[PDB]
Amino acid sequence: EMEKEFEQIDKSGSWAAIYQDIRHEASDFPCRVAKLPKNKNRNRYRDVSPFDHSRIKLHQEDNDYINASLIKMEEAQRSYILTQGPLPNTCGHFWEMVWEQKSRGVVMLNRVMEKGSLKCAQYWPQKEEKEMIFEDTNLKLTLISEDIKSYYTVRQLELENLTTQETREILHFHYTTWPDFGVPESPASFLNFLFKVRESGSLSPEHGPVVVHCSAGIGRSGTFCLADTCLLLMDKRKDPSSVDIKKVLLEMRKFRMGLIQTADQLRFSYLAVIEGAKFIMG
Numbered sequence: 001e002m003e004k005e006f007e008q009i010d011k012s013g014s015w016a017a018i019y020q021d022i023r024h025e026a027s028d029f030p031c032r033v034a035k036l037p038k039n040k041n042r043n044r045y046r047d048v049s050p051f052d053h054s055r056i057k058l059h060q061e062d063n064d065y066i067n068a069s070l071i072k073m074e075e076a077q078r079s080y081i082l083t084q085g086p087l088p089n090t091c092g093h094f095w096e097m098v099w100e101q102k103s104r105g106v107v108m109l110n111r112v113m114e115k116g117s118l119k120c121a122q123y124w125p126q127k128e129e130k131e132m133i134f135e136d137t138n139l140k141l142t143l144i145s146e147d148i149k150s151y152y153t154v155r156q157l158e159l160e161n162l163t164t165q166e167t168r169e170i171l172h173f174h175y176t177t178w179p180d181f182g183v184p185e186s187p188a189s190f191l192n193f194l195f196k197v198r199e200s201g202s203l204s205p206e207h208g209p210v211v212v213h214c215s216a217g218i219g220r221s222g223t224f225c226l227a228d229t230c231l232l233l234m235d236k237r238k239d240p241s242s243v244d245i246k247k248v249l250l251e252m253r254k255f256r257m258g259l260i261q262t263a264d265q266l267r268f269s270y271l272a273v274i275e276g277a278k279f280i281m282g
């Protein structure tokens, strides 16, 4: 029982202590390509880089670098591409990846501006009549429709490979209510957001992996992925009480560094899963 474990950590207020153990045990792999001088401007943060073994490679002979990692959960049979919020110069790389990986959905967990500063480039068109064109990767992006709700917004986008004239419908799932500081009050809205993404089929195997991001693509993105897999795992195994979130997180951390950046975030992940399990259980 993780809820029981939850109350023990809260009781003895040892969240920070536990988050730190996870941090210490976490994997550590080379990020050589990410550190190459040529890719300097392709990274938003100096300390957040994709391990070389799990990075996403753009299908171009020039520079195949993009700060994104493929997190493959074998047991859950769920894959996710966690990446940083694109930069002024990597928006075309970002959509090239979505196209190349055959992604159906894009999950954004932050706002373009937070705490008074740019946390992500405006990488999608805000008006139907103002489509965007990324000349470097020869891609056209069009806002087909948008649905703004209290806690999030779903956008229907059309991505066209100008080279082939081929087009695909991309679902933009944007969580707009994540607090500037700390984590959400209750996991409620977050979980609903997750289920909406699920319902879309964006997380399903008949499509490429979903593309998730916030600013660094490790903190909030990690929460989204950790929560989803754990819930899925409790839905698959014979004993849902066997799903160890700390264990799952460490497994994901073999694919990208720093998933879950704070003890608050970790605590929140527990809430999300515990609260999500009460509903998803039936």
Ligand SMILES: O=C(O)C(=O)N(c1ccccc1C(=O)O)c1cccc2ccc(O)cc12
Residues within 6 Å of the ligand: 045, 048, 119, 182, 214, 215, 216, 217, 218, 219, 220, 221, 261, 262
């Ligand atoms: O974009 C992220 O991965 C995010 O999770 N980060 C956070 C880290 C600690 C506390 C809160 C957050 C948050 O945004 O909810 C971040 C991780 C790594 C580097 C970051 C640089 C700037 C920033 O605003 C958030 C970062």
